[PDB]
Design a protein around this ligand. Structure first.
Ligand code: SAH
Ligand code: SAH
Lengths: 249, 249
């Protein structure tokens, strides 16, 4: 019943946070099992080389199929119709964007393997050949350029594992994007701090007005920061009139 | 001349990867200085409490202004006109998206402080009050929900620090999104592996044809995975005709 994550990387230590904070707690609840594997275990030469110059010339290095292929073959055997193949996630800025829908889908997986790139990335034939053994997804965490895939593993792992029942715990298991909108601001005690008062509606005890305030603040934050998300929705008169009030200042 | 990063968190150990791989090398080149601070140092009660129930009712916990405010005040003094204030980055899924343009801008900063949220996040008054001391940016790394802000610090740090001269090193300092397109696939030796041959143009030595192939493959990957990015560009006849050939199959 535990999700198994296997990560193949030249920097195993980068994945130490998979055993910290909430994911570490998930392991102690038998909800998560983590294996981190040094890609160099599969390098044959004495130099433990994992990369080589790109075909076509040009700078940089590309990771070697003769190392990656055996590594992926071996890790797949660690606890065929497509649905029965394990999932292989390959972080790359040229992959389809990671979405909350992906996180929900992947929370159902029994076994996720991650292939972590560095340098120019992994020879593309590794990804194609891996389809014989895995369901393969290339995935970008956003429109920006990282140094390696390891940090993207940590991102995806957080978003996926927190959707496994029991991981968040009784207090946080109850978010942004859920209804197409960003979440608004939150407040706690004291009522007044450094001259700033919590919105008075929140101390009114009136559940209907508090709930409307929360909706307004979500519309307002979305309008401020991601107004194009509102263009994709049909707002009712209450919400549309509120947003028009923002546009008029 | 070194960029200083200070991170405030209830899980300092999560930031251990700031001293691994390339960022660890950057520290050893005097290009980066990292401080990680336990938020609980600023908790007053014997219980070292950093969070409390939200105003308005409802589940979850919100991090306390009476802990965050002093923490941010103290860390700002660690090596006023707006431009002279340090930059405070506050990861939140309700923040403006992190972009490569942000990464370029922030690579010029002398001092970046990160406030890492957990639970429902940080009382919003902390963010507003912090504007007296910092230039403040709320930033989302993507449209998905994480457990804490620590992993988003690792993401932003990779994307920013790799733009500091000297960090990538002579071999990788020369990417996706640079021209609005995703990068295409890369290949290395051997020419044939598991029945898959590297594209023959790449072994032709013809630089003009190789360069055109690289452009086509970038257009193709973008069309496959992010076709809306092509809608935002005026492609010339060579590129538009190529993409139309993809649409016709
Ligand atoms: N936005 C992103 N999402 C997921 N992984 C990323 C990423 N940015 C970089 N990476 C990881 O970091 C590695 C090196 S960056 C590869 C850079 C390439 N020249 C390009 O710009 O397309 C990638 O192979 C991938 O594993
Ligand atoms: N996409 C994202 N980008 C940056 N930080 C994120 C993030 N998702 C979660 N976080 C971090 O994780 C913390 C807890 S998640 C807060 C969840 C909130 N109820 C909501 O859905 O809006 C946030 O406060 C932030 O620090």
């Amino acid at each position: 019943n535990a999700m198994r994550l296997d990560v193949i990387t030249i920097f195993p230590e980068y994945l130490d946070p998979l055993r910290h904070a909430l994911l570490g707690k998930a392991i102690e609840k038998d909800l998560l099992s983590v294996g981190v594997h040094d890609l160099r275990l599969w390098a044959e030469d004495a130099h433990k080389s994992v990369d080589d110059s790109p075909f076509g010339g040009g700078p940089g290095m590309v990771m070697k199929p003769t190392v990656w292929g055996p590594a992926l073959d071996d890790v797949a055997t660690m606890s065929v119709a497509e649905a029965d193949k394990p999932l292989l996630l390959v972080p790359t800025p040229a992959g389809a964007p990671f979405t909350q829908e992906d996180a929900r889908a992947w929370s159902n997986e029994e076994h996720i393997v991650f292939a972590c790139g560095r340098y120019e990335g992994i020879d593309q034939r590794v990804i194609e050949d891996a389809k014989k053994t895995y369901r393969v997804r290339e995935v970008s965490i956003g429109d920006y350029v990282l140094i390696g895939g390891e940090v993207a593993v940590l991102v995806i792992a957080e978003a996926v594992v927190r959707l496994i029942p029991g991981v968040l715990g009784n207090t946080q298991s109850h978010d942004s994007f859920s209804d197409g909108l960003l979440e608004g601001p939150s407040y706690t005690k004291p009522r007044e701090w450094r001259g700033l008062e919590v919105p008075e509606v929140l101390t009114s005890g009136n559940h209907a007005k508090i709930e409307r305030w929360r909706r307004e603040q979500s519309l307002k934050r979305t309008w401020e920061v991601r107004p194009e998300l509102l263009d994709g929705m049909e707002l009712d008169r209450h919400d549309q009139a509120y947003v028009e009030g923002l546009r008029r200042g």
